[PDB]
Every structure is written in C-alpha cells, then in structure tokens.
Coordinates of C-alpha atoms in Angstrom, one line a residue:
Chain A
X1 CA 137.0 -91.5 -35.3
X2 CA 139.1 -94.6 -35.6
X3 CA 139.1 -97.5 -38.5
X4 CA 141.3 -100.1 -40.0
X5 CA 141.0 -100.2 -43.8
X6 CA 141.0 -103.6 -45.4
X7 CA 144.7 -103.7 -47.1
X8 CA 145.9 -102.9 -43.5
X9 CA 145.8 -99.0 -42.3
X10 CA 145.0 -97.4 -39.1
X11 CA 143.3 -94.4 -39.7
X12 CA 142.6 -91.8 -36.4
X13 CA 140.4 -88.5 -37.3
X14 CA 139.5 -90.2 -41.0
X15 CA 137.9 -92.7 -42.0
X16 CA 140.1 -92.8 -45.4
X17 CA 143.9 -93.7 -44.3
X18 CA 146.8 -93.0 -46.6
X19 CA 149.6 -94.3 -44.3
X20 CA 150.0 -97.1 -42.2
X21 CA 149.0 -94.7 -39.5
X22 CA 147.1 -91.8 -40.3
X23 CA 145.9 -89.6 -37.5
X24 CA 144.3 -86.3 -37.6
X25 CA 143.8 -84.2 -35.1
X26 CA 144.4 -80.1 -33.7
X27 CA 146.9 -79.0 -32.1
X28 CA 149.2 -81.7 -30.4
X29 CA 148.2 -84.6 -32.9
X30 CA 150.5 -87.2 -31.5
X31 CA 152.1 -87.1 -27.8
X32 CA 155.1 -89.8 -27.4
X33 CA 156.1 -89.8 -23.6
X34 CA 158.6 -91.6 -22.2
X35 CA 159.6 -92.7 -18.4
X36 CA 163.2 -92.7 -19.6
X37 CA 165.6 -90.8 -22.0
X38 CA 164.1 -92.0 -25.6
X39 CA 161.4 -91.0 -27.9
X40 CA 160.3 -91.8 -31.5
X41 CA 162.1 -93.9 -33.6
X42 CA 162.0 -93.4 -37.3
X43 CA 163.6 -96.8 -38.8
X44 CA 164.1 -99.3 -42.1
X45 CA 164.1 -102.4 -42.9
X46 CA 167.4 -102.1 -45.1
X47 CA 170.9 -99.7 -44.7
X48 CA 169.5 -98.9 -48.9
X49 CA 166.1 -97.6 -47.4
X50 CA 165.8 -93.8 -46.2
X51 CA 164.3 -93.2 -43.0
X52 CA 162.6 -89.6 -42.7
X53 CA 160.5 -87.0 -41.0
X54 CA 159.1 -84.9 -43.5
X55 CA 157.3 -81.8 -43.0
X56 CA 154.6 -80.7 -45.6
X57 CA 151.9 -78.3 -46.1
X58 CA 148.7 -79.8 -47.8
X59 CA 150.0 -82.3 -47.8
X60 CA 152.5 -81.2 -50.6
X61 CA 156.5 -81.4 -49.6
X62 CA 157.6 -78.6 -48.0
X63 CA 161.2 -79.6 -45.7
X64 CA 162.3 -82.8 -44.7
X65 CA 165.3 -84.1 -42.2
X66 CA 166.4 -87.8 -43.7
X67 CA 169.6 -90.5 -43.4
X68 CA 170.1 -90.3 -47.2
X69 CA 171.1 -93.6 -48.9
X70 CA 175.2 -93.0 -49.5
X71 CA 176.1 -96.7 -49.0
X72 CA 178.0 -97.7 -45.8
X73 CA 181.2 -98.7 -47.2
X74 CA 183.2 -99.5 -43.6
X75 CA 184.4 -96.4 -41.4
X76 CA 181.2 -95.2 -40.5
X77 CA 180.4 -94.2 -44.1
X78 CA 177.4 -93.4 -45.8
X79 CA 174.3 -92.8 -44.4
X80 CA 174.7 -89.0 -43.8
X81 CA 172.5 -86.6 -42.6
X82 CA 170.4 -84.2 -44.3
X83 CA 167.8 -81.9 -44.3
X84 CA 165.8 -81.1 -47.9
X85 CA 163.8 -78.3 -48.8
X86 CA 161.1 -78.7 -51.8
X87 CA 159.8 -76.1 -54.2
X88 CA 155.8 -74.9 -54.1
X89 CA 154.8 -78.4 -55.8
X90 CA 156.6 -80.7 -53.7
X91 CA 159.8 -81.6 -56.2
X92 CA 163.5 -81.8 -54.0
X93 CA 165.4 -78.1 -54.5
X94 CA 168.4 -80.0 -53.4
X95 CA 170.0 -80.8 -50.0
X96 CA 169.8 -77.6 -47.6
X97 CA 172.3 -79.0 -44.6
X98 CA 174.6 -82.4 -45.2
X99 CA 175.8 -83.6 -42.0
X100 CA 178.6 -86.3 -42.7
X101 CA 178.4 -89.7 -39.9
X102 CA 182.0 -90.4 -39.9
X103 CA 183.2 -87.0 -39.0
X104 CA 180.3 -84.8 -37.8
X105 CA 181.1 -82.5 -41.0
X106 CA 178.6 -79.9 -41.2
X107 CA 178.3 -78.7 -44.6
X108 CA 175.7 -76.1 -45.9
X109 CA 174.8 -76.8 -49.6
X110 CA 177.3 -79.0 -49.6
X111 CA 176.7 -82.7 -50.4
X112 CA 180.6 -83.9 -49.3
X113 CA 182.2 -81.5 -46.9
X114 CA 185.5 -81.8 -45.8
X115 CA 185.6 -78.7 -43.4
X116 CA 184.0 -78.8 -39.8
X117 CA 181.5 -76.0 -41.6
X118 CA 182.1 -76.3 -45.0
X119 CA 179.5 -73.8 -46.3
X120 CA 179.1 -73.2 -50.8
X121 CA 177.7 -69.9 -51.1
X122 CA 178.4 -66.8 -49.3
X123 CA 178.5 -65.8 -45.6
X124 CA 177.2 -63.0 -44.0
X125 CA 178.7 -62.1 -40.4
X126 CA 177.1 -59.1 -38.1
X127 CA 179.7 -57.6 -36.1
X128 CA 182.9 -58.2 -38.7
X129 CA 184.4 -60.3 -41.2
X130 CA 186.7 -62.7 -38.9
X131 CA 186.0 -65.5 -36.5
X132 CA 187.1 -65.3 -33.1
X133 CA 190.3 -67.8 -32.1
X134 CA 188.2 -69.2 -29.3
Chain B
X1 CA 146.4 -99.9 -21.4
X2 CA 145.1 -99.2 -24.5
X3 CA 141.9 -96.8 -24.5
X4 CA 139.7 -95.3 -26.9
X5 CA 137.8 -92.1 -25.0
X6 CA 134.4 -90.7 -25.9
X7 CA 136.0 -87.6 -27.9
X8 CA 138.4 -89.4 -30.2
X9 CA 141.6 -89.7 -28.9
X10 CA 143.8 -93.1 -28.6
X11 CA 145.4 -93.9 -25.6
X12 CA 148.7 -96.2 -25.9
X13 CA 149.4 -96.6 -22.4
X14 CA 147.7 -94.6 -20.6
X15 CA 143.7 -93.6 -19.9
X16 CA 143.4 -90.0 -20.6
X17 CA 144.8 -89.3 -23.5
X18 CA 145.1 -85.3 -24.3
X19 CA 146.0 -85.8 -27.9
X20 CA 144.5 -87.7 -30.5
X21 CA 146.9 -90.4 -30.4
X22 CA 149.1 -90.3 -26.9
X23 CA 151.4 -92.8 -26.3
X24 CA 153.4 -93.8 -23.0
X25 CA 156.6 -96.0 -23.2
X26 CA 159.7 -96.4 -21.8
X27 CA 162.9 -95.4 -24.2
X28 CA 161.7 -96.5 -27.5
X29 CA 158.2 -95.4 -27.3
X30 CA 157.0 -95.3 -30.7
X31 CA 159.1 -97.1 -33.5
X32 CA 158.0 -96.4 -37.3
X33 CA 160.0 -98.4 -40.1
X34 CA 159.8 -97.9 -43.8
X35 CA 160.9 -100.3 -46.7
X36 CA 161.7 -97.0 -49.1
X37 CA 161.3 -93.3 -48.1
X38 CA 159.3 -92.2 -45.7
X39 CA 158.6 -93.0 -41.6
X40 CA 157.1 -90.0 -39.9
X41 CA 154.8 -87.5 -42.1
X42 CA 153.9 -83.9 -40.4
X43 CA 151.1 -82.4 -42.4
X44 CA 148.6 -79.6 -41.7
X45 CA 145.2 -78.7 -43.6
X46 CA 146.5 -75.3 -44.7
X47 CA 149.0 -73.2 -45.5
X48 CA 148.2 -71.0 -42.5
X49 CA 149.0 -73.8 -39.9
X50 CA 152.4 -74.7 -39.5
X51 CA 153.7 -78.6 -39.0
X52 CA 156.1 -78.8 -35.9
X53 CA 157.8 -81.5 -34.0
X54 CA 157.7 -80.5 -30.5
X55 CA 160.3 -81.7 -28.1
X56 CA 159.2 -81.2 -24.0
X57 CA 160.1 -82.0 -20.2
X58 CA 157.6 -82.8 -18.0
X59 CA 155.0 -81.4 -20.4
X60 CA 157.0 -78.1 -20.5
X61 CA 158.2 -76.5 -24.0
X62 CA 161.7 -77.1 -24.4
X63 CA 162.7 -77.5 -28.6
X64 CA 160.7 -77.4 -31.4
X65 CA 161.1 -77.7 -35.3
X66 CA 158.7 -76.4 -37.7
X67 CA 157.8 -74.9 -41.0
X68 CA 156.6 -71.4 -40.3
X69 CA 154.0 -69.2 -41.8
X70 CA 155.9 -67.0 -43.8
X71 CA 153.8 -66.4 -46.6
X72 CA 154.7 -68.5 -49.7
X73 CA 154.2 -65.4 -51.5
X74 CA 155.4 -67.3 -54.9
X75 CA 158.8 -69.0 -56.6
X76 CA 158.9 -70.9 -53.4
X77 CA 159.4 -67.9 -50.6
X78 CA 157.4 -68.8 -47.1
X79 CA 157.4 -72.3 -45.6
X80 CA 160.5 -71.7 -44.0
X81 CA 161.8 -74.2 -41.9
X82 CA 162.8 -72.9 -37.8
X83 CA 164.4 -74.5 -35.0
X84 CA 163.0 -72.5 -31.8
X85 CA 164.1 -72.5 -28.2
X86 CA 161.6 -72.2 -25.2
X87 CA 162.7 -71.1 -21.8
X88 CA 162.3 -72.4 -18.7
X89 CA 158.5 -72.0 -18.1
X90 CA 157.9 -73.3 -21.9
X91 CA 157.7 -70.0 -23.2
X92 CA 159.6 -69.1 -27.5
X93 CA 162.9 -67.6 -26.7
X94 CA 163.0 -67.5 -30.9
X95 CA 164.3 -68.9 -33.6
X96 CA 167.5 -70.1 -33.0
X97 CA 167.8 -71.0 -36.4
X98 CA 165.9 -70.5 -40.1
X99 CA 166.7 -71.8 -43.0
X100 CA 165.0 -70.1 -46.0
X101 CA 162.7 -72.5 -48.4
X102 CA 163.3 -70.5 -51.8
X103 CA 167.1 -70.1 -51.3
X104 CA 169.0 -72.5 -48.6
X105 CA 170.4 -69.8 -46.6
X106 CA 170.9 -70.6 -43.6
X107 CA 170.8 -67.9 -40.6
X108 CA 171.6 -68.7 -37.1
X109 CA 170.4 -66.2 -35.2
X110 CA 168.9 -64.4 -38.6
X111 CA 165.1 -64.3 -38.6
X112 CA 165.9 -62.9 -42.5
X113 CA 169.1 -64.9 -43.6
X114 CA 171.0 -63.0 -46.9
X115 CA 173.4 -65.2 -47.4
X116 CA 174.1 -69.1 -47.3
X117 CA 175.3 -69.1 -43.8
X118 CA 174.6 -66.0 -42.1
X119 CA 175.0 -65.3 -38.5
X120 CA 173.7 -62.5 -36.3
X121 CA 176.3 -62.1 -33.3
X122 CA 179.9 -63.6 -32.7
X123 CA 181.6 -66.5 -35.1
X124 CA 184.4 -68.8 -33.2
X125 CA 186.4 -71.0 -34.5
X126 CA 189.2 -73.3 -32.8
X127 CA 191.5 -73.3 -35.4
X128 CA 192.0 -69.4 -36.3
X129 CA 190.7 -66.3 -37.5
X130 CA 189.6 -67.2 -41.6
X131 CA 187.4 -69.2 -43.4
X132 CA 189.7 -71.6 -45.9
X133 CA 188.8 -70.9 -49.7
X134 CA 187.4 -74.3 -50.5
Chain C
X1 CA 148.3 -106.7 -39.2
X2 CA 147.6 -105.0 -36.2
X3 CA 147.8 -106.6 -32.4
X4 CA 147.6 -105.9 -28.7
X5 CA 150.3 -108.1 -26.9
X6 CA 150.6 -109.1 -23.5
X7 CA 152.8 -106.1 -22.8
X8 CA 150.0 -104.3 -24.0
X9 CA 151.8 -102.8 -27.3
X10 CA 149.8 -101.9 -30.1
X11 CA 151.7 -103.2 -33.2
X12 CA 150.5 -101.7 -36.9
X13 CA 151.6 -104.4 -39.9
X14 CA 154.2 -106.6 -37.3
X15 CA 153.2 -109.0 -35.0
X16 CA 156.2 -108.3 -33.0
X17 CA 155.6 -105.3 -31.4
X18 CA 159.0 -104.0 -29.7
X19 CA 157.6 -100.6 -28.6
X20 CA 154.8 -98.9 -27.0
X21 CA 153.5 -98.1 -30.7
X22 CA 155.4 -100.0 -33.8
X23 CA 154.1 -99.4 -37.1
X24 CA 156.2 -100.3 -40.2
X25 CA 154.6 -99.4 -43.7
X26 CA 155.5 -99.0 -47.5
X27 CA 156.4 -95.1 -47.9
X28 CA 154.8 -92.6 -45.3
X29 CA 154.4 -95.1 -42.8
X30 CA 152.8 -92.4 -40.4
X31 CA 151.0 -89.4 -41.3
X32 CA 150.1 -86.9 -38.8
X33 CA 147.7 -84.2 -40.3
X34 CA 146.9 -81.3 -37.9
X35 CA 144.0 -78.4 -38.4
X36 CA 146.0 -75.8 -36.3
X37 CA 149.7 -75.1 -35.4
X38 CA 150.8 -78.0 -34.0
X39 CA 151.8 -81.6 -34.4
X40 CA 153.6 -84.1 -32.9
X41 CA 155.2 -83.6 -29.6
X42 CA 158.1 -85.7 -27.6
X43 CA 157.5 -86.0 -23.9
X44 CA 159.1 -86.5 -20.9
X45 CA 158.0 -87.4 -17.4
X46 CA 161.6 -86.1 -15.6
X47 CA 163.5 -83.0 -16.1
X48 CA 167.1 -85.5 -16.3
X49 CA 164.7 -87.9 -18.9
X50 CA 165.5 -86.7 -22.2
X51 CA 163.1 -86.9 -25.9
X52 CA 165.2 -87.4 -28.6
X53 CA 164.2 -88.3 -32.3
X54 CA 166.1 -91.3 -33.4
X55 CA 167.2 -92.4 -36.6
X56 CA 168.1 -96.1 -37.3
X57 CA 168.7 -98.3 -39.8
X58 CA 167.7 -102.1 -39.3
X59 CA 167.2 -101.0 -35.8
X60 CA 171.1 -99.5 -35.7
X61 CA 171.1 -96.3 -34.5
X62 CA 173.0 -93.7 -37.1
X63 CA 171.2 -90.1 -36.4
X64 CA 169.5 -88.1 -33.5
X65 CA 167.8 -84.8 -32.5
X66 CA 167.4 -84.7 -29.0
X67 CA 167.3 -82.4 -26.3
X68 CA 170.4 -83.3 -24.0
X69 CA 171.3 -84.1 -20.8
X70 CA 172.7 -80.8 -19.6
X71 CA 171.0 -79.5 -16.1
X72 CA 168.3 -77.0 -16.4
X73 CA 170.0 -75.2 -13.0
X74 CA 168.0 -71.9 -13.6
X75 CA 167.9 -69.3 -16.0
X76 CA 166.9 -71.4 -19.2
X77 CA 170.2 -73.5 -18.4
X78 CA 170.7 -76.9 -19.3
X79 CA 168.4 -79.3 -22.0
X80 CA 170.1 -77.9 -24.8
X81 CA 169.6 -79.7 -28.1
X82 CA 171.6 -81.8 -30.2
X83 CA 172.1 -83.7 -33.2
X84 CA 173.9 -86.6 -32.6
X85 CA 175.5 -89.3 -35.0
X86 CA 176.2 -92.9 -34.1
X87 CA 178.9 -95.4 -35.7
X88 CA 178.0 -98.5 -38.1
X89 CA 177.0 -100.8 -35.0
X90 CA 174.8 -97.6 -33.2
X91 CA 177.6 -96.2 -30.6
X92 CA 176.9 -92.7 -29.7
X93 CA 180.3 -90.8 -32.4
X94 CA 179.9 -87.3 -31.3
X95 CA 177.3 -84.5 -30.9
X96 CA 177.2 -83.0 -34.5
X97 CA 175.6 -80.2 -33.8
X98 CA 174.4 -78.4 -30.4
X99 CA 172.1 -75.7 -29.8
X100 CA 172.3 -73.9 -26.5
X101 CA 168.8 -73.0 -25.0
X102 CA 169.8 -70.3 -23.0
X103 CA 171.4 -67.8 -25.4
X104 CA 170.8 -69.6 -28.9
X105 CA 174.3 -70.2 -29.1
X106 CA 175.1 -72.6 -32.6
X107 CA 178.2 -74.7 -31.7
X108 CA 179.3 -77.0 -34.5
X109 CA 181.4 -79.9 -32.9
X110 CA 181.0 -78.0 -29.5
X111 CA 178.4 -79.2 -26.4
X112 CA 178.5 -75.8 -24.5
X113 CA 179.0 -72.7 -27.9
X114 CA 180.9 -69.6 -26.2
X115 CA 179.6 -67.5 -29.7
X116 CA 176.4 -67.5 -31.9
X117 CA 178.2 -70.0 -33.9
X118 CA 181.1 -71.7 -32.3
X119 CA 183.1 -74.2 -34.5
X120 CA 185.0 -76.9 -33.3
X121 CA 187.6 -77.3 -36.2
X122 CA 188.0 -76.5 -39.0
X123 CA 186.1 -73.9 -41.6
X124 CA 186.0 -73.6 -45.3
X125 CA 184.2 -71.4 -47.5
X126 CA 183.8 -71.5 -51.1
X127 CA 183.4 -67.7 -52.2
X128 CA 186.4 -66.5 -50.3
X129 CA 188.5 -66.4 -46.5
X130 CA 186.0 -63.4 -44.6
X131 CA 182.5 -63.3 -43.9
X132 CA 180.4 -60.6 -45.4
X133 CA 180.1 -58.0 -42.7
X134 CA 176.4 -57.6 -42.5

C-alpha cells in the first residue's frame, strides 16, 4: 500500500510513484483537517516558480488554478491569478479567468484587465441588457 | 501520531484515518512546495470520475471545485470545470459557477454558458448601469 | 528525504518539516489519483474554523480560496467562499472574489453580492456597453 522509491518518492495506493507524493485512493483521497482557520498550502521555492493545483483526467491536463510567473516589480505586482483550461491532449488553451494581486481585477479572457470585470468576448445577461446601480 | 492501519490508509496525526492519506494539523496542515510548475495534482482513473477539491466544516460539505462529467464529446467539449455550493446539512445547492473547457465562457449561475461571461439572474454594478467598450 | 520529528511531522524531501505534512518536489510535487468522484478534501473541526487553499511564494502568502468567516446563522447562511489576494510581504489586500452560499450570489470586489453578479467598481467589455439579453 505504501513505499518510498529510491530517488526519494512516497508512493500511497502504488507501488510506482510519479510525484514526491503519490497517493491513490477512492473517494476522499486526501483529508487535510485543521484545529484552526488554515488548510493546504501550495508553495515555491522562488517568486519565478509557479505554484499550482491542477486538475486532470488520466492523468492528462484538463483545468488548473496557478500564481502565474508575471514578475513582482514593487506595488504588489506580478504574481496574478489564474485559472487555465487545456485541450483533449493536455496543451494550455490559454488563461480562462486572470485575477490581477494589486487591484483584485477580475478579468475573463483577459491576461491584463483594467476594469473590476474586464470580460473580452461577449456577455450574455437573463433578465435585460443593463446592470443594476446597486 | 503517525499510523499506518490494516486497510491502507496513512494517518498524519491522528489513528483512524478515513482516507487514504488523512492529515490533522493546526493552520498550515499540509505545505507542498515546487521548484517549477506544479504543487498539488488532482487526477482520477477515468474520464467518468471527476477530480474535486472539497472544502468542509466539521466534516460537513460546504464548497467544492471540480471538473465535471460532461462528456468530452470531442474538440475539447466536457471536462468542464464547476464551483458548487452545499447547504447546510452538506447537501449540492448547484453550480454556482461553470466555466466551459472547449470555449472559456464563463456562466455564473449558467449550467450551459453561451457567451464569455454569461449570467442567469440580476447583474449589479456600483458605478452605473453599462458595461465600458474596452 | 523523508522524517518523523519530534512534533511528530512527517516531512517528504526536507528535513525541516514546518507542517503536519511538508513535501517539496521537482514539478507535481503531489499527485492525488482517485478511482471514483472524489479527491482531496479541506477540513475543519469548528464551524468559525475556516479551510482555505493557500497560495505562497517562498512561504509569502499571494493567493487563497477559502471558505470565509461569515456565520452559518441558519438557512445555508454564512461560510461563503472567497478568493482572496495578499500584498508582496503576505497581508491579507482584499477578497477578490466571493461566492455567497446561500443564493449563489457572484460578487466581484463585494463580501455579501445583493445580485447573481454584483460588481464592486468598475466594468468593461470588449464587444460593446449592454449584455446580450439571453
């Protein structure tokens, strides 16, 4: 159920890791719990390194929420937000929601927006064409 | 602290674990660092069974984000990635939001989104009644 | 590369474990494969204790998805989530993005969204100033 390959992987569920961890399991593979407001943290060693959760399917890419590499300049620059979907064999179709860190910018296929939603592409309301003033 | 049980599942922390790897901690319970891309990889066996990270309270469903099982019917359709919202009792109160794998769109509220952003219900905004033309 | 500490943290290519589980890895880091729908859940042990998924960068917080600290007073109130983004030294900026768990409710720049997408701000679009009615 458990082994620890020679380079230096944990595997749980194989006997053949991939990763530094590698479990396998059904259903809830991994429970994190925590006695206080936290969880999992996904980190790097270096601000030009991209640390990501990435969703795939066989294991082929699929979606993937990252901190992309846009180099932190002063101002709370760079290292943005974004969330990457990938075609049927696992190459990036481009950057599906960019979320800027120095002013919460939410742009959808946008890679710099400069409105609160900045959205590239068409929008599509329900019940009419204007916002509300809230 | 650490346990391995009879079954196969690692226990960080605690003695009965109910996955195969549960892990107990205060604030930063699990930390996973990468020196390129990568940190936290959520795979399943097949294209039937869909990757989620689950977010609970007190072992009740509260958030979860996933790539559903929309069939990837071809040229990259299914596989769509959903943000769902449980309620109280942990029970789906839907898809708050999907964001389609072959095209981007994003629909809040919009199981089927048709355009980049669309939205099924009211749109507010602060700062008046149009979008700019960016 | 891999120890047990006094502590009793299980550390995976450190020897300086600083959480209940700290891998660090080329790439992947940590793969977790499920055979069913499922994956890798967040936990809490207290309704006011919050999971959150934590992005740093040389342990400097810059992005999180979390489930926030609103009360759950009834009715699928409170625990909403949010996306969060931090400044260069890992202060908490401002909640990017917040999901309300109740009604579903996207705010953009907002913590409690009056409409299915509230924005704080303001709102461009590239193809014109209206939504499409739908």
């Amino acid at each position: 159920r458990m082994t620890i390959d020679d380079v230096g992987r944990v595997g749980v569920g194989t006997t053949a890791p991939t990763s530094a961890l590698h479990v396998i399991g059904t259903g809830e593979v991994a429970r994190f719990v925590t006695s206080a407001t936290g969880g999992v943290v996904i980190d790097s060693t270096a601000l030009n390194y991209n640390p990501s959760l990435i969703y795939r399917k066989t294991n082929i890419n699929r979606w993937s929420m990252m901190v992309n590499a846009a180099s932190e300049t002063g101002g709370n620059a760079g290292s943005n937000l974004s969330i990457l979907r990938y075609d049927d064999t696992g190459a990036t179709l481009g950057a599906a929601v960019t979320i800027d860190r120095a002013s919460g910018f939410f742009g959808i296929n946008t890679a710099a927006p400069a409105y609160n939603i900045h959205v590239t592409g068409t929008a599509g309301l329900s019940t009419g064409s204007a916002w509300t003033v809230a």
